[PDB]
Design a protein around this motif. Structure first.
Motif, PDB file in Angstrom:
ATOM      1  N   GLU A 261       0.658  -1.014   0.106  1.00  0.00           N
ATOM      2  CA  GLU A 261       0.142  -0.297   0.055  1.00  0.00           C
ATOM      3  C   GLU A 261       0.782   1.143   0.298  1.00  0.00           C
ATOM      4  OE1 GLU A 261      -2.389  -0.040   3.306  1.00  0.00           O
ATOM      5  OE2 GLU A 261      -3.404  -1.747   2.405  1.00  0.00           O
TER       6      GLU A 261
ATOM      7  N   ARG B 104      -5.397  -2.042  -2.977  1.00  0.00           N
ATOM      8  CA  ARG B 104      -6.780  -2.547  -2.254  1.00  0.00           C
ATOM      9  C   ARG B 104      -8.356  -2.281  -3.279  1.00  0.00           C
ATOM     10  NH1 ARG B 104      -4.323   1.485   0.082  1.00  0.00           N
ATOM     11  NH2 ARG B 104      -5.190   3.182  -1.213  1.00  0.00           N
ATOM     12  N   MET B 105      -7.374  -1.474  -4.266  1.00  0.00           N
ATOM     13  CA  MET B 105      -9.048  -1.297  -5.598  1.00  0.00           C
ATOM     14  C   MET B 105      -9.115  -2.584  -6.186  1.00  0.00           C
ATOM     15  SD  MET B 105      -9.750   0.199  -8.766  1.00  0.00           S
ATOM     16  CE  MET B 105      -8.641   1.007  -9.299  1.00  0.00           C
TER      17      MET B 105
ATOM     18  N   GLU C  20      -9.219  -5.323  -5.130  1.00  0.00           N
ATOM     19  CA  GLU C  20      -9.671  -6.273  -4.145  1.00  0.00           C
ATOM     20  C   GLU C  20     -10.818  -6.416  -3.803  1.00  0.00           C
ATOM     21  OE1 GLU C  20      -9.838  -8.986  -2.966  1.00  0.00           O
ATOM     22  OE2 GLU C  20      -8.160  -9.951  -4.172  1.00  0.00           O
ATOM     23  N   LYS C  21     -10.919  -4.381  -3.336  1.00  0.00           N
ATOM     24  CA  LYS C  21     -12.510  -3.396  -3.397  1.00  0.00           C
ATOM     25  C   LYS C  21     -12.788  -3.726  -4.550  1.00  0.00           C
ATOM     26  CE  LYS C  21     -11.456   1.132  -2.611  1.00  0.00           C
ATOM     27  NZ  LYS C  21     -10.692   2.321  -2.313  1.00  0.00           N
ATOM     28  N   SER C  22     -12.774  -3.573  -5.286  1.00  0.00           N
ATOM     29  CA  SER C  22     -13.745  -3.315  -7.012  1.00  0.00           C
ATOM     30  C   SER C  22     -14.344  -5.041  -6.466  1.00  0.00           C
ATOM     31  CB  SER C  22     -13.242  -3.314  -7.875  1.00  0.00           C
ATOM     32  OG  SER C  22     -12.949  -1.739  -8.203  1.00  0.00           O
TER      33      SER C  22
ATOM     34  N   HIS D 259     -14.433  -7.225  -3.568  1.00  0.00           N
ATOM     35  CA  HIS D 259     -16.025  -6.927  -3.108  1.00  0.00           C
ATOM     36  C   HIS D 259     -16.933  -6.713  -3.405  1.00  0.00           C
ATOM     37  CE1 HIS D 259     -11.627  -7.725  -0.309  1.00  0.00           C
ATOM     38  NE2 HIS D 259     -12.436  -8.253  -0.060  1.00  0.00           N
ATOM     39  N   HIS D 260     -16.550  -5.401  -3.631  1.00  0.00           N
ATOM     40  CA  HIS D 260     -18.137  -4.978  -4.455  1.00  0.00           C
ATOM     41  C   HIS D 260     -18.741  -5.781  -6.100  1.00  0.00           C
ATOM     42  CE1 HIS D 260     -18.079  -1.078  -3.279  1.00  0.00           C
ATOM     43  NE2 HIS D 260     -16.437  -0.194  -3.262  1.00  0.00           N
TER      44      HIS D 260
END
Ligand SMILES: COCCN1CCN(c2nc(SCCc3ccc(OC)c(OC)c3)c(C#N)c3c2COC(C)(C)C3)CC1
Lengths: 46, 1033
Positions: free
Chosen positions: B507, B518-519, B521-523, B525-526
């Motif tokens: 990070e 993140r983004m 894995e964060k997408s 998570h979406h």
């Protein structure tokens, strides 16, 4: 010895761009992978 | 048991180097030639019968050699073709995999099964059995620049100096020479022979007498007399060594005596042995030599030596002699090596630039810097023990191997950093535990990815010969990966590593990644509302699988099914076809224009117009010229307009404007071992014995049926020539005996003046060359020149041929092309621009089955191997995947898991069916190799998913929900770590349009969208069958 300077600047842009078109796929169409909501289960034999 | 080997560290560091040091010898022991021995083993029996006819050159020569062919050992077809120059080329082509070495042995144990059923002049003229794999090496032309040397002056200089020095340069196992040596051509002069009351009998009789080498013997020979002291060895009449020493060849007693010279009746000079070939290189006269590289096919060090051997001869050249190479392999070979060895090393560096996106370290990231080249140099090494040459097919067997070495090493790395980067524990916690979850999987990862390549490594044909160059290369890429994953990977994933903190996936490390690590894995998570939102109600999402299959089933038979693409081979042959009975002067006169065309209209592209008059691929004679028009590098030929298919279309279109000849202009096929042209080769059969007219006129019904589809079948044309006029001379044989002449004074006169006749040898610069009597040219041109030939009667008076021989004219087909003892007529033709051969050959099969029984259609040459691909290459998918359909039950311990993991396969099948037609490429062999690369990629990710689901139920105890939130959410990251490696291994090929990488990017874009189906689709469809099929079963 020039294409290792190509793959310095063109393998630092064509690695995230292929990583970016899939984001237009898996997140753009991933929302249309959830527009479909329903059941159609073919449990006729069971 | 490989876990017992982990704790021995430097055991594992350097067995990797063992496979590399043996592979370091594999540089010094692999022959390199871009198209290996992949043809069916053919044999060309090149007879000769100079000056003779064609209707009865098959009957003197060919029908004899054809009628010994009892049950030919592993045969496919024997086609022969006699023509008007007296040339016979019986072509015995055998089954593939049958030994070509025993073939040329056994052809001369089929010919030399039953020789003296030969009327023995069959071999007395000179016949030459030859393994004519009609690929060449460089086809070196030797031209004169100023013009002092003629053609034949060169062709002797080449054959007296070059050929015997080139045919033992290493790698060369065959030098073909063009056209022939010198030969003391005795041009007779019939208005001088009648002056002396001679015939060409007595011209030949004195040359077989006074030019004859005579074994005189020895003074003091064996046994001696008692009392001997002298030994010599008598020189009798030698072979006469010069033009002037044939000039004083005597003919009779001379009380005219300036003793009756053969130079008083015959214009003696040197010259070639046949003049059917005029090879004018850029309109300037040339010889040539077509080199054929031996088995041991090292096209580099041969051509690195040959281009040195020519430079040794450039001091020896006479006035203005120049070497130019029209055809070659090596400028199509050399940069395809040095890039795809560097790109290969760039892909090694790209694999490091994969984990500069993932690891961002030095000592934990240096693992595939060693782990990748071990699979690479070992693939060199084991194939060097199994006899597989560096070529396209095993350099493209190594770029495709990049996707099979990333599935082991880098997959362990994030499975190891599943413990470090996701939980924060030492790598010893990930050394045995994380490997132990996949040690039983690398039993199956090695299993199911070698399984789909099993049947192609054993199947026959040239299609099988392409497969065996691919399959055992990928198998050696597999077998030297699991033998490296279970050795090299654990000692580099336990020893030299770095402790990393918990929760840090990079990070605070270099900008754009930290916001993205993140983004992604964060997408994801979406995408958890797509992780769960698909798997809950799986009812509607089963009919989505048919939408994948309906797109597959409709866009595969509609996908054009070619065999091999048109390679930009840097040459293209332009053949000329004059009227039936047009001279070598007129065919040269058109190759004046065509050379002037390719040196004013396309001088920016065309290197050279080596233009062989008279000879032609598909047809010889004097009405048929050909030009080996050569090109430059792609750096000098930019863009779509300067490729071959754009040039030949501009050629052929402007050649319709060229009067007097159907001048096609085509391209060589992809592999040059098979085809005259590309496209296909429509043979024909004499089924019932329909004769010659309806033999020709069903063939004219064929162009009434197949040439009238001009959109798809582009330029369907025959090979067997139209019936030329032949000049029957009725030797009115009773007048030809009542006049007093014996007819052997006539047939020798009529057939060794007009004919051209071998007499004997002679010596020329200490070399044996032939002696040819013939008429001087202006005394055999017309039917008027019948009347000038004088024959001697019994009483020594002279009689003309016009006194008795009543001439006339008739038909006659020069190219009497045969087939196993059946006369035939070969038909060529290409396919449409933008379409394929399979929608043109089966189009021909709509138009070849139109004819009734009696004249049949055969598909061989290039056309056999695609008729063999149509019988086994989609049928390859049956017995390959059914073993995979039975590999899963061994791995997953159920009949019903092969109902599931065998349906990851059409996810990527449609991944390549899109990427072909999105650029517009065909279903060739390589597309299927792209499919077998893609199907390998689909089943690879399932083991990280479904065997992991097998592993969870023992070690972590998970149903569907807790499994998928840990399997799919976490173990999708190593799938990206093979995705950015292999599919970006063709990133230097996406922007490459040079050495035929076109249908090789439809592989790479095909596996990319196949990875897109691995990105969303394939990570559900076996857990889709966890809620249905595991609900069912
Ligand atoms: C009698 O000839 C039978 C051999 N055939 C197969 C090889 N073919 C070919 N010959 C040549 S060079 C021919 C040298 C030559 C010299 C003098 C001649 O006059 C005597 C002559 O006429 C034959 C040829 C080339 C090229 N470049 C290619 C082919 C064939 O295609 C390539 C792309 C390899 C380029 C020639 C025709």
């Amino acid at each position: 010895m020039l294409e290792l300077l190509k793959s310095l600047v063109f393998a630092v842009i064509m690695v995230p761009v292929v990583m970016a078109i899939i984001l237009g796929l898996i997140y753009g169409l991933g929302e249309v992978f959830n527009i479909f909501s329903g059941v159609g289960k073919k449990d006729q034999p069971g | 048991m490989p876990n017992f080997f982990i704790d021995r560290p430097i055991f594992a560091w350097v067995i990797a180097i063992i496979i590399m040091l043996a592979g370091g010898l594999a540089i010094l022991k692999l022959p390199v030639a871009q198209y290996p021995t992949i043809a069916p083993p053919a044999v060309t029996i090149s007879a000769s019968y100079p000056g003779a006819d064609a209707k009865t050159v098959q009957d003197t020569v060919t029908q004899v050699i054809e009628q010994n062919m009892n049950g030919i050992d592993n045969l496919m077809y024997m086609s022969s073709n006699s023509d008007s120059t007296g040339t016979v080329q019986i072509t015995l082509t055998f089954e593939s995999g049958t030994d070509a070495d025993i073939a040329q042995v056994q052809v001369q144990n089929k010919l030399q099964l039953a020789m003296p059923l030969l009327p023995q002049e069959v071999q007395q003229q000179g016949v030459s059995v030859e393994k004519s794999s009609s690929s060449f090496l460089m086809v070196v032309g030797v031209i004169n620049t100023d013009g002092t040397m003629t053609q034949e002056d060169i062709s002797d200089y080449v054959a007296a100096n070059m050929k015997d020095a080139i045919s033992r340069t290493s790698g060369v196992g065959d030098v073909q020479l063009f056209g022939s040596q010198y030969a003391m051509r005795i041009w007779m002069n019939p208005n001088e022979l009648n002056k002396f009351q001679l015939t060409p009998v007595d011209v030949i009789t004195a040359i077989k007498a006074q030019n004859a080498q005579v074994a005189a013997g020895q003074l003091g020979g064996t046994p001696p007399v008692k009392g001997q002291q002298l030994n010599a060895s008598i020189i009798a009449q030698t072979r006469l060594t010069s033009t002037e020493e044939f000039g004083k060849i005597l003919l009779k007693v001379n009380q005219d005596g300036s003793r009756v010279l053969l130079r008083d009746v015959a214009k003696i000079e040197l010259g070639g042995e046949n003049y059917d070939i005029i090879a004018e290189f850029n309109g300037q006269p040339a010889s040539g030599l077509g080199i054929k590289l031996a088995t041991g096919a090292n096209a580099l060090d041969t051509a690195a030596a040959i281009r040195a051997e020519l430079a040794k001869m450039e001091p020896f050249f006479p006035s203005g002699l120049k070497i130019v190479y029209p055809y070659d392999t090596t400028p199509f070979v050399k940069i395809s090596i040095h890039e795809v060895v560097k790109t290969l090393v760039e892909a090694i560096i790209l694999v490091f630039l994969v984990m500069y996106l993932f690891l961002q370290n030095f000592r934990a990231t240096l693992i595939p810097t060693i782990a990748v080249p071990v699979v690479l140099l070992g693939t060199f090494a084991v194939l060097a023990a199994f006899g597989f040459s560096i070529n396209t097919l095993t350099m493209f067997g190594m770029v495709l191997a990049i996707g099979l070495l990333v599935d082991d090493a880098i997959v362990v790395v994030e499975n190891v950093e599943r413990v470090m980067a996701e939980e924060g524990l030492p790598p010893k916690e990930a050394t045995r535990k994380s490997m132990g979850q996949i040690q039983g999987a690398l039993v199956g990862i090695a299993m199911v990815l070698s399984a789909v390549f099993v049947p192609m490594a054993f199947f026959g044909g040239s299609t099988g010969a392409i497969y065996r160059q691919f399959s055992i290369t990928i198998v050696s890429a597999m077998a030297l990966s699991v033998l490296v994953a279970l050795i090299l990977t654990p000692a580099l994933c336990a020893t030299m590593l770095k402790p990393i903190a918990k929760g840090d996936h990079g990070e605070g490390k270099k900008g754009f990644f930290g916001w993205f690590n993140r983004m992604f894995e964060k997408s994801t998570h979406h995408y958890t509302d797509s992780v769960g939102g698909i798997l809950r109600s799986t009812g509607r999402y089963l009919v989505l699988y048919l939408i994948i299959v309906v797109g597959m089933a409709y866009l595969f038979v509609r996908l054009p099914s070619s065999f091999l693409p048109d390679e930009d081979q840097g040459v293209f042959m332009t053949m000329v076809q004059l009227p039936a009975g047009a001279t070598q002067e007129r065919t040269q006169k058109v190759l004046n224009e065509v050379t002037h065309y390719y040196l004013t209209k396309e001088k920016n592209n065309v290197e050279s117009v080596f233009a062989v008059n008279g000879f032609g691929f598909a047809g010889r004679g004097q009405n048929t010229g050909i030009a080996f028009v050569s090109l430059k590098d792609w750096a000098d030929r930019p863009g779509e307009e300067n490729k071959v298919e754009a040039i030949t279309m501009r050629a052929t279109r402007a050649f319709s404007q060229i009067k007097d000849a159907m001048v096609f202009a085509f391209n060589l096929p992809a592999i040059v071992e098979l085809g005259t042209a590309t496209g296909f080769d429509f043979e024909l059969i004499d089924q019932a014995g329909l004769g010659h007219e309806k033999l020709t006129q069903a063939r004219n019904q064929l162009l009434a049926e197949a040439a009238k589809h001009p959109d798809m079948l582009t330029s369907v044309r025959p090979n067997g020539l139209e019936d030329t006029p032949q000049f029957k001379i009725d030797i009115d044989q009773e007048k030809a005996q009542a006049l007093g002449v014996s007819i052997n004074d006539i047939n020798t006169t009529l057939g060794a003046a007009w004919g051209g006749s071998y007499v004997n040898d002679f010596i020329d610069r200490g070399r044996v060359k032939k002696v040819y009597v013939m008429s001087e040219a202006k005394y055999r041109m017309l039917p008027d020149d019948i009347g000038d030939w004088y024959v001697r009667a019994a009483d020594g008076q002279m009689v003309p041929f016009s006194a008795f021989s009543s001439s006339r004219w008739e038909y006659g087909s020069p190219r009497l092309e045969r087939y196993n003892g059946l006369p035939s007529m070969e038909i060529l033709g290409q396919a449409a621009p933008g379409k394929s051969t399979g929608e043109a050959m089966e189009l021909m099969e709509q138009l070849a089955s139109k004819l009734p029984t009696g004249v049949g259609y055969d598909w061989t040459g290039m056309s056999y191997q695609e008729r063999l691909s149509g019988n086994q290459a989609p049928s390859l998918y049956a017995i390959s995947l059914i073993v995979v359909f039975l590999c899963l039950a061994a791995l997953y311990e159920s009949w019903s898991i092969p109902f599931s993991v065998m349906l990851v396969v059409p996810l990527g099948v449609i991944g390549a069916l899109l990427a072909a037609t999105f650029r517009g490429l065909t279903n060739d062999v390589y597309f299927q190799v792209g499919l077998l690369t893609t199907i390998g990629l689909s089943a690879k990710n399932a083991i990280l998913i479904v065997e992991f689901a097998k592993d969870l139920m023992d070690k972590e105890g998970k149903g569907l929900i807790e499994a998928t939130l840990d399997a799919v959410r976490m173990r999708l990251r190593p799938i990206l770590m093979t995705s950015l490696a292999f599919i970006l291994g063709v990133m230097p090929l996406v922007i490459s349009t040079g050495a035929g990488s076109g249908a090789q990017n439809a592989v790479g874009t095909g596996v990319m969208g196949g990875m897109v189906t691995a990105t969303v689709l394939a990570i559900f469809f076996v857990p889709v069958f966890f809620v249905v099929v595991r609900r069912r079963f």
